[PDB]
Design a protein around this nucleic acid. Sequence first.
DNA 1: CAGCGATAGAGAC
DNA 2: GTCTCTATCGCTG
Length: 66
Amino acid sequence: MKNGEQNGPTTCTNCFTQTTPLWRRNPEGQPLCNACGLFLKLHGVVRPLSLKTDVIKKRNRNSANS
DNA sequence: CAGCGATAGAGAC
DNA sequence: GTCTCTATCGCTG
Ligand SMILES: [Zn+2]
């Protein structure tokens, strides 16, 4: 389609967040967003998802990213 | 050209 | 000053 816009709604099975810079996955084949896969895998233990937030701090960038 | 992993940085008190 | 949590970068095919 010429729309090219959104067509596949990915869902984080851990926090349902649809806003993320990189989609991660669990060694079990379950889809995760950014922090869920990075944080859960490194901790190996469940932790209050209460850390759920819709606001993410944006960091600086390189001179130019193609 | 795009996607991913690992490491390090920053913030608040 | 120290500690924790999260994101981006660089590299390869
Ligand atoms: Zn998530």
